[model samples]
Target: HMKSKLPKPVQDLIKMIFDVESMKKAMVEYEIDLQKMPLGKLSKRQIQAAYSILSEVQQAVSQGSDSQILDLSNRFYTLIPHDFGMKKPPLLNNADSVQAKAEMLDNLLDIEVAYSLLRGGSDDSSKDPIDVNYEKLKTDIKVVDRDSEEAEIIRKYVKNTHATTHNAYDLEVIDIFKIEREGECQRYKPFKQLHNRRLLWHGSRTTNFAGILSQGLRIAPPEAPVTGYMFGKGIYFADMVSKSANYCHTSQGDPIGLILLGEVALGNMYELKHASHISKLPKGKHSVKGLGKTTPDPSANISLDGVDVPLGTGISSGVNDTSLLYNEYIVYDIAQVNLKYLLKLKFNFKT
Candidate 1:
């Protein structure tokens, strides 16, 4: 019997497998605690906005005794390492996979609303900003929820916060998003890209946020316009924009040619794919990594552009770089899914 004992390495592997999975079940209890932080202690409405989002993620966990749910939330909270940045399994544990889900939302307009609030509050602004009232302006357009109370409040608060946060202080919470259930769940930059765009266009959002809030609300840290965020994307866009500051309607739009095709998550948007145009920038080459040019549509080859024989940009491998650039259109809205597997084998050890 002693000779039949498994090797030490095999025993360690068995324990590693069990503990890794046990850690996931433990996180739900942790996320629930974040939601319960007594928000009533805060006096300001903007600060309450932050609470709204933090609560949403908590409520999702409370919905059921589902063991793997919160563990799977490794989908978002990209920066948090509770799961070791692993795309956890859906029903079980799989340590080999990774996942990412990008967000895009036109659901609400914080910047435009902020601009409108300042105009409405002060006559010194535009001659007629109220004339551009988006509430009234959105006649033919279809919105997620036009009649919702939360929608109205968001528009109202953001309009005010944007104006106030923009100039009032050096640090501020300009905008956040959350799911509204019995109360509020959590708030994130509803649109991460917009947050990125704003940072690219303006200097420091934390500072800008603080500055704008200080205009009206009396807070401890008045918006002295103190700067934050020392990064690549932070400095590059500002420098580039400064290099050729031109008038604009929207910060650069995600190329329409870049269309999504498949769905991985029912509620998720903007999936990632390997692109012919995408490449990792050398260290310190740019603020963000994997920056590259957009590859043109290769399928629209000699069919229209040239007088050559049957010509198309689609190459053998599907990716075209530089002069050899083959137009490999992406399969849009394609999500890289993270699935879990619960494996129980009684072959080696009886249950």
Candidate 2:
């Protein structure tokens, strides 16, 4: 029996991310009709077709033509069947719903990648399944030693930045892995020296890891509606761990989750109190910071490898006149983010 040389935790992570069952589960959770659009049936062309239909729907909604909106919505559902059962599928007449479907298509594109990798290459009968899966990820994930200072910093980050009221579940970090995606270093080299760089949190579902690690965080495609983005189509980051953790979309049945720590090069920030749907920034601004009532105490911030790690305890930002509760950072360019660490967390749900 061939054994995988990778550490047990790394192997588990690899298996979890590449698991076809979990990928299907994510699709079902997203309300996709798996019977109509199985993994084998998923393709870029089909997804592109769906996006074009959605773009038409967005335009129809903007025109406020009920018949056109209904017709386009039906066409969209026909092209990409959603599991709405016997009930009538809702018309995509608004930005939020249209954006939600577009996001699903975005995720479906990644799901296609994960499923394709599973069916890829010649069947090597001699290789262990774990090793095969690990090889497919095309990214290096090294387990951080528990006793090391790096691990301690990560643990502190997990503990200190946790929300006390909202999403107050205690998070027990299961493992910390340092990630190095292939070609990521070269992609990030240009912004490495940019000023005001900080390490921030980005959480995503387990099924999305394969695509995220392989493709890096991305902006919404142009085919998607412009109004969908809260702060425009940029890679969003959070100062509070819980703020990002909520994006993981975890539940009681599935408590374990994954979150990323990325070194973001924010040379200058254009702070906003409310949603702007900004498409472009002014000359001097490098990124957008949606100011919140609460943020990590700036004085308690720490540094790791010359990048500021905002692992400071949460505190009031003294900004009362804002729509957000917690601070969010958005970068227009994907190259500005250097994913430094991945944390596997167990959410200990509190009554």
For model 1, the stretches where C-alpha displacement exceeds 4 angstroms are 1-121, 124-283, 287-294, 297-351
Judge candidate 1 at residue 267 and give its lDDT. 23
Model 1 Cα shift for residue 285 (angstroms): 3.0
Model 1: worst 10 consecutive residues (lDDT sum): 254-263
Model 2: per-residue Cα lDDT over 73-108, one tens digit each: 898898888888896988788888777987788788
How well does each candidate superpose onto the true structure, as a TM-score? Answer: 0.20, 0.95
What is the Cα-based lDDT of residue 231 in candidate 1? 16
CA lDDT for candidate 1 = 0.22
Q: How far is candidate 1 from the true structure (C-alpha RMSD, Å)?
A: 25.8
The lDDT of each candidate is: 0.22, 0.85
- 41-125: candidate 1 lDDT, tens digit per residue: 2123333332233233334544544454444444324222222223343331221111011100010112222333333443323
